[model samples]
Target chain A: QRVTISCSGSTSNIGGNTVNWFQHLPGTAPKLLIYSNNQRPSGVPDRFSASKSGTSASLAISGLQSEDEAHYYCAAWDDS
Target chain B: QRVTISCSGSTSNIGGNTVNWFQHLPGTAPKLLIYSNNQRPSGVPDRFSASKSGTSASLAISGLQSEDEAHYYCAAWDDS
Candidate 1:
């Protein structure tokens, strides 16, 4: 869809000091779809999307499946 | 069944808030299950949700159905 979604904050007081979103495809690598630039890969599913508005980034998935069942995680960088 | 993943920071940093959590439902698009600690988007079906305790976070879904199955993700705000 070419939709670049983004989220930012006053910079959090939490460790791993950045915000992130990702997707897990069964047994495949969890794709690094978006980062600080709202840049996602072309192969990422359109049904899957993310956005960081202010201090919180969000991921949205419409179509779910048993195979789609995987553990997803978001992370950033920090020295804390 | 209701399952919630509790997310927290080992210590609060600049606040990238890497402890973000999200869920993807079948054929519906991604759902903003949680943010920060235990904040969810408005009108979320109760069937899907989030929670947090200490330096951990959670995403809970009750009444397991076929459609309730999908990829579940938690993000760490990493500057890396």
Candidate 2:
């Protein structure tokens, strides 16, 4: 599936500051996927990209593989 | 097995703006469990509680069952 997933929040976060992403598998804790708006950490692959619009952000997974089929989450830094 | 999962962050996200917790199960998306530290949303079971210490946060599950086996995450904003 070539669908885009987004995380939306209120003025507390998405309206300002930044949003982060997490990728999780069955037997382990979630790992940092994206930080700030679009920054990825050391081991994250290039297929994952992040975007933001208004008070929402999205994590796009291209070239989706069976291993990519896992739980994804987004967190916003509500600096209010 | 009864377990206690911790989410640790630097001054970047766990120092000032409070931390939020999410629970992600097999099929459904992640749901808000605790917000702004310890404040549970409606319908959340009493077994889950959030506590913070210094720059880290913890999510506690007292009576964990097979159904309770899921991925849990925490997030905080570093007002800087």
Candidate 3:
């Protein structure tokens, strides 16, 4: 199974910028899962992928194991 | 007095991009504080400001109050 979390922001935020993804489990700091639009750190499951298009971004998780359930958030950077 | 926290990423992360900030309080997930550099969400104090230069980003807290204590994190995109 697969699940996706979506994030959308204003043009001034998501446009002409990049997006980062983080996941947080209870009692732990939010962990960086994706950056550079889609790069993942070693040991991060390939089941998790980051995607961005236009004014929105998404995080997709496959193999929906119970541990995959947690708080997911996205941040965008604008280089001005 | 003012406190400044910094987050630096590689050229692949912070270069020519914007930065977003998060603040985590106990027993809760991280909260989005600043996005697109310095845009604070409603209810966030104007004393909190975010800035970026090249591959480095900083968050400045002016008029720090006791209630402002928390863990902070920053994120950026590479636009790839």
Candidate 4:
């Protein structure tokens, strides 16, 4: 079980430059997984991992499953 | 005591409307508590949340991680 995905806001209106992520499964669509954090794109599953700490970015998933319990996100650029 | 935020699909693109959320603890960079489901936006800590059903929107932090556990979002009004 590993989970650590964050996001702050005010990089213009999303959360602080470069950091996109997504995942949603109860129905479908919302895949992406991780982007910029620890970088994972292209089949996603090196156990899935990500990291960032200036604007906050973290998405980790170590082994745990229940389909990994979807509904995770991390986008960037927000100014407010 | 309460936890049920579900999102399905096609409601234009974001399940529906008025559904914002945020909570990124650990290091710092995400806050806005919630926006539609249950409504919250002043100080935050109604346990932090949001919710929806049809198209898809959910944010339930029922008695969770406490700290170092943030990354939930279900934005709205996206026509692209």
Instruction: Please report the candidate that would top lDDT against the real structure.
Output: 1
Which one is best on DockQ? 1
For model 2, report DockQ: 0.03
For model 2, the superposed segments whose C-alpha errors exceed 4 Å read: A1-72, A78-80, B1-65
For candidate 3 chain B, the 10 contiguous residues with the lowest summed lDDT are B62-71
CAPRI verdict (incorrect, acceptable, medium, high) for model 3: incorrect
C-alpha RMSD values across all candidates: 22.7, 24.3, 23.6, 24.5
Q: Judged by TM-score relative to the true structure, which candidate is superior, 1 or 3?
A: 1
lDDT of 1 at A17: 27
Q: Give one digit per residue, the lDDT tens place, for model 1 in A16-80.
A: 52233334323333332322322221212222223221122334232222111222333333546
- Per-residue lDDT tens digits of candidate 4, residues B1-80? 34444433211111222223223323433333322222111211222232111111233232211223233454433334
Over the true interface residues, superposed, what is the Cα RMSD of model 1? 22.7
* lDDT of every predicted structure (CA atoms): 0.29, 0.25, 0.27, 0.26
List TM-scores for all candidates, in order. 0.17, 0.15, 0.14, 0.14
lDDT (Cα, tens digit) per residue for candidate 1, span B1-80: 34444443222133234432343423333333433433332222232323211111223232211132222244443334
Candidate 4 per-residue C-alpha lDDT over A1-80 given as tens digits, one digit per residue, 9 for 90 to 100: 34443443211112222212222323333333322212121212232223221121223332211121223344233333
- Which whole-number lDDT from 0 to 100 does residue A40 have in model 1? 25
Question: Total clashing residue pairs per candidate?
Answer: 58, 0, 4, 20
Candidate 1 chain A minimal-lDDT segment of 10 residues: A62-71
TM-score: model 3 vs. ground truth: 0.14
TM-scores, chain A, per candidate:
0.15, 0.15, 0.16, 0.14
